[PDB]
Paper text:
Leptin, a hormone primarily secreted by adipocytes, regulates energy balance and systemic metabolism through its interaction with the leptin receptor (LEPR). Here, we report the x-ray crystal structures of a leptin-neutralizing antibody (hLep3) in the unbound and leptin-bound states.
Using papain digestion, we prepared a Fab from the LepAb, which we subjected to crystallization either in complex with human leptin or alone. (D) The superposition of the unbound Fab (orange) and Fab:leptin complex (light chain, cyan; heavy chain, light blue) shows conformational changes, with a root mean square deviation of 0.44 Å for 220 Cα atoms. The largest difference occurs in the CDR H3 loop (heavy chain residues 100 to 107), where residues 102 to 107 are unmodeled in the unbound Fab because of a lack of interpretable electron density. Notably, we observe only minor conformational changes in the Fab upon complex formation. Consistent with other antibody:antigen complexes, the Fab antibody undergoes limited induced fit upon leptin binding, enhancing shape complementarity at the interface.
Author numbering:
A (entry chain B): 3 to 57, 60 to 111, 114 to 213
B (entry chain A): 2 to 101, 108 to 135, 143 to 222
The structure:
């Protein structure tokens, strides 16, 4: 019911404005617009209520005009990167409904740090082998991961995660290569390559 | 004030789940209690609400006919029961107090609707001017697991990465910590993994 920009971005110290538009049955006709902040992996918190009142630093503010509302964040901080949801009471549907949400990102490029762990001795004794390629501290989120055993691309047994957000506003990710002990011992080296903005970091382990 | 919710649950498609939401101080009844779900990667979805003292409930049209919101002013506990579960209902359900705007939210209860079965993890040690050691929490289901180091005494250099849903349907996670190399001989590093869905807890020592 309420439309929100999918994402907004700004550098530290800038003023950002997130919009929330509806019709005459919700934002129009008087019904107030609440604004909630959800940090990565947490429950929402009440930022603004009643269009302009705070429970919340003074940096956050809200305004309402016609069938639109806007949340202004002045002096953007790293702690502000988060999902912002506008909520309003729809009179036709009769209920409090949220918006799509806006992912506020606080912006400098950064190449990844990669760490490759070979299979554990216990894991090999458990008839299992798992190589672990951990990537951390890279911005933006985009990242590619490829595996090679003795230079030949390995494509079966690869499980990689989508770039998640760190607590430092950067990104991290992880990739896993599953093998049987005999497969791991039958090659002389395995390697993971992490590509990011044209720069690739390649790590290698050997039995 | 604090709103505490029941533990995460695994249910099969078609069954019914009931999440609780108890108060820890306040006039729980004179306020309203809203129930809001959030699926992985999606936004919030207002499921419904209830004013306990009066006993009056409201349900969004979407979940109408399937969701039952009840409240006890004596125990000061709200309940949200969802029946005829589906794979799409898999989500985190929050309860939020609001005077009758939600200002007090709960921790959220993860409800996973899948025909799979709960399983505990296998915790393997990842052995190493900076060394890096860690723990691999493999082959567990469902989310989430929690990882600490030295029972919480070690937080410097800790990074617990997101899990990955392997092709086997089981998740696998890693948590690493970077430490001085010289301390590897003297200090002891132990990762404490806890998977409450399967009620498993393992303290695994990472040795060079």
């Amino acid at each position: 019911v309420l439309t929100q920009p999918p994402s907004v971005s700004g550098a530290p110290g800038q003023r950002v404005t997130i919009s929330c538009t509806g019709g005459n049955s919700n934002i129009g006709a008087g019904y107030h617009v609440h604004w909630y902040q959800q940090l990565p992996g947490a429950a929402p918190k009440l930022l603004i209520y009643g269009d302009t009142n705070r429970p919340v630093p003074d940096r956050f503010s809200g305004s309402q005009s016609g069938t639109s509302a806007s949340l202004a964040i002045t002096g953007l901080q790293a702690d502000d990167e988060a999902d912002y949801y506008c909520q309003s009471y729809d009179r036709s549907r009769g209920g409090w409904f949220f918006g799509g949400g806006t992912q506020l990102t606080v912006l400098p490029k950064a190449a990844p740090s990669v760490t490759l762990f070979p299979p554990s001795s216990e894991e090999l004794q458990a008839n299992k082998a798992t190589l672990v390629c951990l990537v951390s501290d890279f911005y933006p989120g985009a990242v590619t991961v490829a595996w090679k055993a003795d230079g030949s691309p390995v494509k079966v047994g690869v499980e990689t995660t989508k770039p998640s957000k760190q607590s430092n506003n950067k990104y991290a990710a992880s990739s896993y290569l599953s093998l049987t002990p005999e497969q791991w011992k039958s090659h002389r080296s395995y390697s993971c390559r992490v590509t990011h903005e044209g720069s690739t970091v390649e790590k290698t382990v050997a039995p | 004030v604090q709103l505490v919710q029941s533990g995460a649950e695994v249910k099969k498609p078609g069954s019914s789940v009931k999440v609780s939401c108890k108060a820890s101080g306040g006039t729980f009844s004179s306020y309203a209690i809203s129930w809001v779900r959030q699926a992985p990667g999606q936004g919030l979805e207002w499921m419904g609400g209830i004013i306990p003292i009066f006993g009056t409930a409201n349900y969004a049209q979407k979940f109408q006919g399937r969701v039952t919101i009840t409240a006890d002013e004596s125990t000061s506990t709200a309940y949200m029961e969802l029946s005829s579960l589906r794979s799409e209902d898999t989500a985190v359900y929050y309860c939020a107090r609001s005077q009758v705007g939600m200002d007090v939210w709960g921790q959220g209860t993860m409800v996973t609707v899948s025909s799979a079965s709960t399983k505990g993890p296998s915790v393997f040690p990842l052995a190493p001017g900076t060394a890096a050691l860690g723990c691999l929490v493999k082959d567990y289901f469902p989310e989430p697991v929690t990882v600490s180091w030295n029972s919480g005494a070690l937080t410097s250099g800790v990074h617990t990465f997101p899990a990955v849903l392997q092709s086997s349907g089981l998740y696998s996670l890693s948590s690493v910590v970077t430490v001085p190399s010289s301390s590897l001989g003297t200090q002891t590093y132990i990762c404490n993994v806890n998977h409450k869905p399967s009620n498993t807890k393992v303290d695994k020592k990472v040795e060079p």
